[PDB]
Design a binder for this molecule. Structure first.
Ligand SMILES: CC1=C2C(=O)c3c(O)cccc3C=C2C[C@@H](CC(=O)O)O1
Ligand SMILES: CC1=C2C(=O)c3c(O)cccc3C=C2C[C@@H](CC(=O)O)O1
Ligand SMILES: CC1=C2C(=O)c3c(O)cccc3C=C2C[C@@H](CC(=O)O)O1
Lengths: 135, 135, 135
């Protein structure tokens, strides 16, 4: 179980390196072909890689000379073939005028193993602490 | 030693998921029955689960529509039955009006194994960088 | 490979505990004797332990009653004897007047194993998101 814990962290790190450098297709390829990505509460999830890549192009043309970073911490995993991962995300956004911190986001991932033994994300369910607090 | 490193991270993650969702009793149950929690310098530590749960109800009624998050990083462990954990904490607090970042806190934990093989926290000793800098 | 992942995190944690407490010599001793440290883009890297310790004394006398913290997240490792580590750094600086957050920094480390089996840093290559965004 220790080895899976490190494997999930490695997989999440690679995922986010690709996302934050704008490689939206590489990011979608770390999801399963039917992968669910609910990135913002209220909005319906993107489902499948094509919908994921499209929803990231929407979100990023919508607000774009910017460098975002997603910092994951506080990972807890739980278990036939699938694993649930609960963790914290902190979003950072660097502009020429400075660095905006937030939001803070609890996230639940579900991972499965592919045919080649590599992990893939079946689902990612993001909450937003700012939006949770309003309600 | 690698496997213990992941086990400490998993245990700390579960602890803080319970604390940050206000499940103060679940949090106290991850400490030993005689567990020491020195959460703020100057103040005497809460000792035992009941004192821990009481001191968290004091601290949180004292300042409460809020969502706090504790992000742990930079874990280093050292060693018969006990393990010392040194790490960094960053506190985040989300209000309707926004997100306050800080303080930054170096923390020392001492963990032991219970009868059932699960880890428990014998002690947690928190420093506050803001208060350290004044002195 | 899981065990190396935890070993790199442990090594990075110890390195930064020494740096952030101003133990610049201990920090330089976690690098190889010919270790490369490019801490800021544009400036030439410090090479060897003596140059590292000197460049940290320059940087810190240059701006110093302060407590800095370096939080590492998002580690991904890749491979005869050497390992590459890509990760995120977030810098925190606590003053009497408050806490400044940033910058956010992608970092690449190269680690090797010493004669005694302990890891050492052959190179550390820091980028600055704020400076990357200007260009
Ligand atoms: C694009 C985006 C997010 C993410 O993509 C995300 C993620 O991929 C993994 C883990 C967490 C997240 C969190 C977010 C937050 C949201 C960004 C925003 O509201 O500024 O919209
Ligand atoms: C309630 C509280 C803290 C914690 O409980 C804490 C912790 O449980 C584990 C690791 C670190 C911490 C740090 C703190 C800081 C302190 C909060 C504040 O001063 O706002 O008071
Ligand atoms: C002293 C310093 C840095 C570091 O030393 C550093 C590091 O040792 C490991 C990993 C990342 C870093 C990042 C920095 C950033 C830079 C600090 C600044 O510009 O304020 O100058």
């Amino acid at each position: 179980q220790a080895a899976l814990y490190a494997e999930v962290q490695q997989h999440q790190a690679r995922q986010m390196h690709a996302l934050d450098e704008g490689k939206f297709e590489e990011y979608a390829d770390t999801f399963t072909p039917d992968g669910v990505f609910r990135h913002t509460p209220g909005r319906d999830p993107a489902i499948g890689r094509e919908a994921i890549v499209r929803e990231l192009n929407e979100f990023h043309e919508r607000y774009a000379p910017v460098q975002r970073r997603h910092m994951f911490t506080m990972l807890a995993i739980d278990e036939d073939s699938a694993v649930q991962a609960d963790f914290y995300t902190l979003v950072l956004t660097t502009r020429v005028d400075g660095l905006t911190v937030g939001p803070s986001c609890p996230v639940r991932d579900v991972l499965v193993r592919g045919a080649d033994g590599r992990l893939l994300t079946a689902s990612r369910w993001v909450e937003h602490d700012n939006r949770t607090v309003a309600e």
